[PDB]
Amino acid sequence: MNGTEGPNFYVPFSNKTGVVRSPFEAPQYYLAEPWQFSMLAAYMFLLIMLGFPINFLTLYVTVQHKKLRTPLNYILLNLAVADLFMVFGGFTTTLYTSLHGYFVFGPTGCNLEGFFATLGGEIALWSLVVLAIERYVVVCKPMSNFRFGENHAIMGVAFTWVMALACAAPPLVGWSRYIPEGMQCSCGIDYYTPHEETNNESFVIYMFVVHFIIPLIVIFFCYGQLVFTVKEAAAQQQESATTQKAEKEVTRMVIIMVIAFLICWLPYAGVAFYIFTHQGSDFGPIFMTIPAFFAKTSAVYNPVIYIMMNKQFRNCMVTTLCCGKN
């Protein structure tokens, strides 16, 4: 034995020496040194100091630059809101708790923080998907006489919020549950504990299939198509230097977007899969924090890729950051 179970938590440390306390009641300095808790807090601090400005600016610059307010940008704004949910639901809370050494807000707080952090990360996830779809639709033109307009943009946004609730909401009402994770200072979805009363096993399969494999398939198909369309277009138009550049830039971007989606979610999926395949294993509190590190950091790198690296947003951001103009 190497864990310690409680009514609604799973401390990844054996109580054979009797030192384990509830992660809702007292510091967990026995499953990690106090300094490592400070580094946890340091990391949440970084993600805020970088994460909030990047994502807030994205909304701000949109309020003040007409040209950004197009239907094809809605999903990107959406991405930025998702990131902020992660910032204020997840990151700030975790900065606060890590410095106490445990999840001082109790089980209900655990349900709130876990819900908003998950909602955030999930809306972001499905945004990145919807965006690949919209790009495929607009560029690959797989539908005769179709024009992407405001209404589709809205459906796309609504679709992400529905898919995200499809993930964050069940654990609030019986299908899986939220419980402190890693170092017990933040709450996630229980995907590593065989907990029958809530049906964790079927939920983990559902998550992996509907919320990882599907997204992965849809992204790969769409951007694969796009890279295909663009390679072909350029080959049939080699007299155009510009078209040759677009083909190269678009290919580079797709490699960055796909690799970036992997880095962000592969760890959660990889780890989840291993625990499912190797039922009951010694997994430490720090190692269980790794998948979170990869996902949560996307609140910074996603907007770098999808906003800062977007020519339009960038210019507007530079103009706004440099006072009047530049």
Partner: peptide, 11 residues
């Protein structure tokens, strides 16, 4: 492609 690539912020 070019206009569309601009619209979706990819070029």
């Amino acid at each position: 492609i070019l206009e569309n690539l601009k619209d979706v912020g990819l070029f």
